[PDB]
């Protein structure tokens, strides 16, 4: 047991943590793979998402090579403070932490040749700028940018370890409002004023589930709009009945629009759902406005002609509006 | 690596972090440049915005001059705790932190001539007093104030390293509700009774996007107010129809006004939007009063004249109200 203890002591005796492996030599190649535990929140209000992942980094450090021990040394995670580790960070993360119960979720595993396996369990909130013009028929693309903070490509190089299999767990992710259509791994270099830097990107494509919004948002608006046409089938002289129906459907449309929380009132810019709700609001507005002409053109001064045409124009125009809308947004 | 290791140990050996560069000599000039990552939030309730940036400080320290190595030493971020660094702070900063995953998002880079480059990735919530009287047609000016804590211009000087190009990344800012109209850099000395203190200011001007409020607030109120005029074209004896229209428009207007109070960010003083909703509420209130007068002057005691007059005055006066409103606010 002391032989292993002596071996570890030798490695850290005189070890310089301020100097990267092969300082001044070829850049140290760091390979990364990720196991995604879950995607928790995908918020349009904050335009971000939360991600819990197992993040592994592999690199070779000759200063940590050991012989005579035919085993890979898994060490207490507190030894990571006594080694050089890449200054990797997530360029687009908003807030992140490494889990710490019961201990810090950190792993250091050595191999005889000097390879270091450095694993962390990280929950990171990452910025995902979402395009909500077509909401709720929208498709998003959320990324995770992995970059070196201080070292340029002359010092450190990144690669996905295992190619396109370097990220696992995506198939298991379940989102209450999206489906993971695809994910991609990219590797590139980004050039700044201070030099070029290695970049690894992981991106997902998210397609929103539309079935729920049809029953919740679109269907009630459609039915109320059809109700407003019941006025065209009531006698022109039933002023109380036709005004009550007309103004109460206008009230109903406002009710739907005001506190339909699926409209995302906390995000103030125009979306596809907004256009549709206002399209239906204009129709019910016109159905009641049509009776002003019908009532006036009889009592104030043909009367059946306006109602006769509205029985066709309103159903026809609303279908034309729906056709144009769905084609444009689908 | 040993040669550089001994070179670095030479620099720190005998180093005194408690003394500024050129202690007792000319003031140390600190150049600053900021690479803006994002403005995550801008909240009117708290009157502040959240900013992510790379904050860089650049100065010269003769005690850190090294010779024989024709390279700029990029060191581990932990070496920053063993050097002197400026005591820069943000005057209007409510809360801020340096990102810490995977390592502390901090950078130290030395140069042979003793020049130190010091970068930090900072998320800060900075106070921004906003004048929301013209909300939602308001334009805000949010600043970041950078100052020295315990040094005067006799010891430390600040400047924007690179002139007006000292700040980059402004085109990266994507606020859903605003658009960055302009930004400025200001360098000045603040003179108190205790002396003169260096000050740097970065300020952005934000113009709020109005399109959302056209669809959500102004357009529904205009259509409901117009709908209340349909009463003027109905018979004076259709009391149930004309009262139901007038009273239901009043209920609809309150619904729009009261529920908008919940969706909007609770600013408790009179704004531009409040004046428009109250204007439209008064108009529909007066239209219902118009029928009460018509009903009374007929049954309680001409009648067609009042409706004829109201058919013109109400649309005309509402147009005048809009003209006065938009000129006084646009």
């Amino acid at each position: 047991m002391s032989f292993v203890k002596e071996t570890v002591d030798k490695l850290l005796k005189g070890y310089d943590i301020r100097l990267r492996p092969d300082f001044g030599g070829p850049p140290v190649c760091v390979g990364m793979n990720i196991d995604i535990a879950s995607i928790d929140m995908v918020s349009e209000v904050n335009m971000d998402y939360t991600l819990t992942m197992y993040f592994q980094q592999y690199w070779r450090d000759k200063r940590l090579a050991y012989s005579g021990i035919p085993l890979n040394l898994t060490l207490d995670n507190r030894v990571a403070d006594q080694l050089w580790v890449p200054d990797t960070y997530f360029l687009n993360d908003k807030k992140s932490f490494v889990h710490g119960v019961t201990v810090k979720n950190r792993m250091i595993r050595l191999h005889p040749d000097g390879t270091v396996l450095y694993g962390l369990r990280i929950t990171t909130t990452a910025a995902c700028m979402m395009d909500l013009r077509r909401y709720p028929l929208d498709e998003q693309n959320c990324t995770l940018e992995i970059e070196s903070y201080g070292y340029t490509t002359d010092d450190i190089e990144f690669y996905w370890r295992g190619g396109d299999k370097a990220v696992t767990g995506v198939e298991r992710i379940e989102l209450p409002q999206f489906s993971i259509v695809e994910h991609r791994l990219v590797s590139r270099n980004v050039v700044f004023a201070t030099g070029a830097y290695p970049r690894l990107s992981l991106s997902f494509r998210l397609k929103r589930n539309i079935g729920y919004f049809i029953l919740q948002t679109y269907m009630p608006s459609i039915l109320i709009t059809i109700l407003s046409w019941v006025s065209f089938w009531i006698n022109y002289d039933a002023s109380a009945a036709r005004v009550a129906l007309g103004i109460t459907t206008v009230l109903t449309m406002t009710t739907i629009n005001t506190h339909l929380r699926e409209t995302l009132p906390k995000i103030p810019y125009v979306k596809a759902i907004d256009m549709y709700l206002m399209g239906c609001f204009v129709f019910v507005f016109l159905a009641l406005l049509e009776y002003a002409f019908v009532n006036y053109i009889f009592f104030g001064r043909d009367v059946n002609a306006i109602d006769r045409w509205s029985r066709i124009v309103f159903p026809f125009t609303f279908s034309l509006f729906n056709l144009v809308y769905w084609l444009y947004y689908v | 690596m040993s040669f550089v290791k001994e070179t670095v140990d030479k620099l720190l050996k005998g180093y005194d972090i408690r003394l500024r560069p050129d202690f007792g000599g000319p003031p140390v000039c600190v150049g600053m440049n900021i690479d803006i990552a994002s403005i995550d939030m801008v909240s009117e309730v708290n009157m502040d915005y959240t900013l992510t940036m790379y904050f860089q400080q650049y100065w010269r320290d003769k005690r850190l001059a090294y010779s024989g190595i024709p390279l700029n030493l990029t060191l581990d971020n932990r070496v920053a705790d063993q050097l002197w660094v400026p005591d820069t702070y943000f005057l209007n900063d409510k809360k801020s932190f340096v990102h810490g995953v995977t390592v502390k998002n901090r950078m130290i880079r030395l140069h042979p001539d003793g020049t130190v480059l010091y970068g930090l990735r900072i998320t800060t919530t900075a106070a921004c007093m906003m004048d929301l009287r013209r909300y939602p047609l308001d334009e805000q000016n949010c600043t970041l104030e950078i100052e020295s804590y315990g040094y005067t211009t006799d010891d430390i000087e600040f400047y924007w390293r690179g002139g007006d190009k000292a700040v980059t990344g402004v085109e990266r800012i994507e606020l859903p509700q605003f658009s960055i109209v302009e930004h400025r850099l200001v360098s000045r000395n603040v003179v108190f009774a205790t002396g003169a203190y260096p000050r740097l200011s970065l300020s952005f001007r934000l113009k709020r996007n109005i399109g959302y409020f056209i669809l959500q607030t102004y357009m529904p109120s205009i259509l409901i107010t117009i709908l209340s005029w349909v009463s003027f074209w109905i018979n004076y004896d259709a009391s149930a129809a004309r009262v139901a229209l007038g009273i239901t428009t009043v209920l609809t207007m309150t619904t729009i006004n009261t529920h908008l109070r919940e969706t909007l960010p609770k600013i408790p003083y009179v704004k531009a939007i409040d004046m428009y909703l109250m204007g439209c509420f008064v108009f529909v209130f007066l239209a219902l009063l118009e029928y009460a007068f018509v009903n009374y002057i007929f049954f309680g005691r001409d009648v067609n004249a009042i409706d004829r007059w109201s058919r013109i005055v109400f649309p005309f006066t509402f147009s005048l109200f809009n003209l006065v409103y938009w000129l006084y606010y646009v």
Partner: nanobody
Amino acid sequence: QVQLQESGGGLVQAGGSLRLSCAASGHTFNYPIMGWFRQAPGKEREFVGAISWSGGSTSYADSVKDRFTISRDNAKNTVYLEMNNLKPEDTAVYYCAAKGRYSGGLYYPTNYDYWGQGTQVTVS
């Protein structure tokens, strides 16, 4: 992906003005920053200007500043380069490029993913 095609190039007398349009189709939201470059006959691509997604923010090269302007129209997915007070040195092939949201600085061509076939502008 994104597809870019520039237009509006031609021959203009020195001291005049010209307008170049760049039409973008595809995942234009994934590449919100549009930058303008110019390729001189012998030199390399030189940064000219850039504009954000909202269009309220813009940046220009020092020499080109106060003569050129950049405007955006997300409705038509077009960015315009209004060039005024043209000079003989301005003769070059003006390229339109699109940059991703996290690609570093504006002045480096390597950071732009998609390029157009730059229209030619020559000043007499």
